[PDB]
Each structure stands twice: as structure tokens, then as C-alpha cells.
Design an enzyme around this catalytic site. Structure first.
Site, short mmCIF file in Angstrom:
data_model
loop_
_atom_site.label_atom_id
_atom_site.label_comp_id
_atom_site.label_asym_id
_atom_site.label_seq_id
_atom_site.Cartn_x
_atom_site.Cartn_y
_atom_site.Cartn_z
N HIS A 1 65.97 51.61 10.02
CA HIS A 1 65.18 50.39 10.05
C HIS A 1 64.74 50.04 8.64
CE1 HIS A 1 65.08 50.30 14.40
NE2 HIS A 1 64.58 51.52 14.44
N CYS B 1 67.55 46.23 9.90
CA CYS B 1 67.04 45.01 10.52
C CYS B 1 66.07 44.26 9.60
CB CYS B 1 66.36 45.35 11.84
SG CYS B 1 65.10 46.65 11.69
#
Lengths: 214, 219
Positions: free
Chosen positions: B92, B134
Site C-alpha cells: 500500500h 494504491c
């Protein structure tokens, strides 16, 4: 069926508009130094992009309103009979902001106007932005966007001089990212190498880009 | 004298290290969802970069300390007899940060280790970073740096990595690297059929490269 050598369709009637925002002086209460030799950079780019077939439209020291009015005006014009679009900003730039005469403006506010949703006649066509503004940068707005950064002298700045030299010599033959890669090397030579920050380009392009004579 | 067709010198003894940081699960108090199919992405990249001649070193769910120890370790190793360097992050990512198991780390802290000053044996050699995390991104650290971003918007992996690896497997040993990356931009753009394409955000790459980059087989 997938073609690695596939180029953008560059056989429309017009090449497109080369839009240039040239900022030399600024509103007093912004406390920003005058940018000597940007008019040299502006004249240099006009010259080069005209030989590439662009309709160059220049605007000097526009205020935030006038600037916003013009880009929106350009984004709402039909580019159906155009190959691509070029926008250039010559000013001061803090983070994701470019400076007009009186205030700063977020880059993505400007580039967002040419996204597939808002500017239908440019869908699938290259949208090139050149930012000459004194490690942060804003990500390309969408597909077929190409951001060019100077990552920063009366004859102009190194980036623009070196860009224009390459544009003049190889612009009508080489692939555009090839040419931009060459600029990265030219600016790297100035250091009298390959140790410090050079100019940069972020590509969301999907095809090869050439400016063969029409 | 200036050569437009000039390529990076890719005739060293070794190609270089392909470093992969694969993050699937995360420390509980970070409240981050498990990343299903990153091991698929990791295996896919290993495969592809090995056929390209890289020495692939994988690390799974490393904590901030262990991750920092490894990259620094790799940055202080001699790359004199190597063509280039590749680092991959599968985790992430918020803004200019990537996530380790327990905490986030600034990207430029990681990439700054391979700058001309700190990593002398990589001066003038390509330094490729692939970030699957992301509209913000951190600018390449210096000359010969190439940042590749997924710009994310699935048990066999993510679209970006699948499409990257397909192109790497098919054209990796012949095409110029930014050419190939441009192809990935188009492959991911095709996915949108749920239809009009070329309207939304696709993957991206920021290039501070100074020459053409090819991965011709070493013979």
C-alpha cells in the site's frame, strides 16, 4: 492483435494549438523575483513549435482569471481536426501549483480540463504539458497525457534552450520521448555528471509520438 | 559530437540485482486490508526478470527495520560489474510513502540511497524503481532514475503487473524499455470495457534516463 510500433494518428488537418503562458513579472505582494529571459524562452518555443506545425498562441503575465478563461476557452474549442495539444507554463511553481500574475493555481485544475470526459475531441490524442517552474510533481491527469518538467541567463533557461535545440534538430523525425530523453542528457552535461537532479517527464502516453512534416 | 541512438552500456558481467519487496499482510493497528494475489505478482516478476538475466532477491512482509537494512545493504554492495539496478515495491502507498509490515517509509529515503553521491558503482547506470501502490508521486531522485507507477484504481495478480510481465516476456529482450512501458499503458487502458477508453487514469512512468535502454540477451 497488438502492434508494438503503433504510432498516434498524426494525419489530421491541423497539428493543434501550442498554448504558451509566459510569466516574467508578478504582483508585488507575492514577493516573487522577476524572471529574466523567459521572453527568450517563449520566443524560442514559439519558433520551434511553429516549424512543427502548431498554432502558437502566446499570453504574457496574465492574471488568474484571464489565464483560467483562456485555457477553458481552448479546452472547449473543437480539436476534432487536430493531431494533439500542447500547453506550456513559464513561471514560478510551488508543489502542485503554477503562478499567475496575482495568485497560484493547482496544475490539475488546468490539466483536468483536457481529460477524456471534459474534452471529447482530444480523446486518444496526445496532451502535452511543459512546466518550467522552480521533490514534488503532480501525476498526469489521464491516458495520453505527457507532463514535461524542467526541475530547476538572458538567452533563456538551460531546459528550454536544450529542449528547443533538440526540437529544432530532431523534432520532425525522432519519437518524442526519445527526444525528451536527449534533453535529459544535454542538461546533464551542463554540470562542469549524472549525480544530481535533471529534467524529467511523466508519460501516460499509449503509442509512439512523432511530428513528421504534414 | 552527440548520438541520438546512444544506448546504455549493457555489457557488464552481470545484469544486476532485481530487488522485490512483497507485502501481503500488515500489522493489525495499521488497519490495512490484506493484499490478495501479490504473491502471484511477485512470482510473475521474478520469472520475467530472471529471463532478462537479473539476480532476483525476494522479501516478504518485511518490517520497517528489516526493509531499511536490506536496501541499504544492496546500495552499499558493488554494482561495478553490473548493467543496472531494479527495485520493486508491492504494498500500500499513501502519497510519497510505501508501507512496510509495521509502518510507512518515504520513497525518497529509499531511492536516495542509489543517487550518484551514495552509490558510486551505479553512476551512469539505469536505476529502475517499480511502485505498485494504491494524484501524487515523488519525482525521480536523479539522473538515470526511472520510476514506474501502477496508479491503481484478482487472485492471479493485478492488471499492471500482469500486463507489465506479459510485455516483459514478449518484448523485454528486444524493445527499448520506455517503449515497452508505453505498451503497458495501452494494455491497461484496454481493460476498461465495463466502453470508451483513454478517458481515465492509466499507469505512468517518470523518466530521468539519459540514453536508450535495452535488455538484449547476454552472449
Amino acid at each position: 492483435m497488438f502492434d508494438p510500433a503503433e504510432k498516434y494518428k498524426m494525419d489530421h488537418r491541423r497539428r493543434g494549438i501550442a498554448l504558451i503562458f509566459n510569466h516574467e513579472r508578478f504582483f508585488w505582494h507575492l514577493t516573487l523575483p522577476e524572471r529574466r529571459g523567459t521572453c527568450a524562452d517563449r520566443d524560442n518555443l514559439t519558433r520551434r513549435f511553429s516549424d512543427l506545425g502548431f498554432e502558437v498562441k502566446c499570453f504574457n503575465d496574465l492574471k488568474a482569471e484571464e489565464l483560467l478563461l483562456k485555457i477553458h476557452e481552448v479546452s472547449t474549442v473543437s480539436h476534432a481536426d487536430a493531431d494533439c495539444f500542447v500547453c506550456v507554463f513559464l513561471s514560478h511553481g510551488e508543489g502542485n501549483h503554477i503562478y499567475a500574475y496575482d495568485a497560484k493555481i493547482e496544475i490539475q485544475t488546468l490539466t483536468g480540463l483536457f481529460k477524456g470526459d471534459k474534452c471529447h475531441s482530444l480523446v486518444g490524442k496526445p496532451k502535452i504539458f511543459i512546466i518550467q517552474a522552480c521533490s514534488v510533481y503532480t501525476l498526469p491527469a489521464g491516458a495520453d497525457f505527457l507532463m514535461c518538467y524542467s526541475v530547476a541567463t538572458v538567452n533563456g533557461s538551460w531546459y528550454i534552450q536544450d529542449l528547443c535545440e533538440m526540437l529544432g534538430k530532431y523534432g520532425s523525425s525522432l519519437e518524442f520521448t526519445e527526444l525528451l530523453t536527449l534533453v535529459n542528457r544535454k542538461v546533464d552535461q551542463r554540470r562542469v555528471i549524472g549525480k544530481k537532479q535533471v529534467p524529467c517527464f511523466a508519460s501516460m502516453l499509449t503509442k509512439k509520438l512523432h511530428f513528421f512534416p504534414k
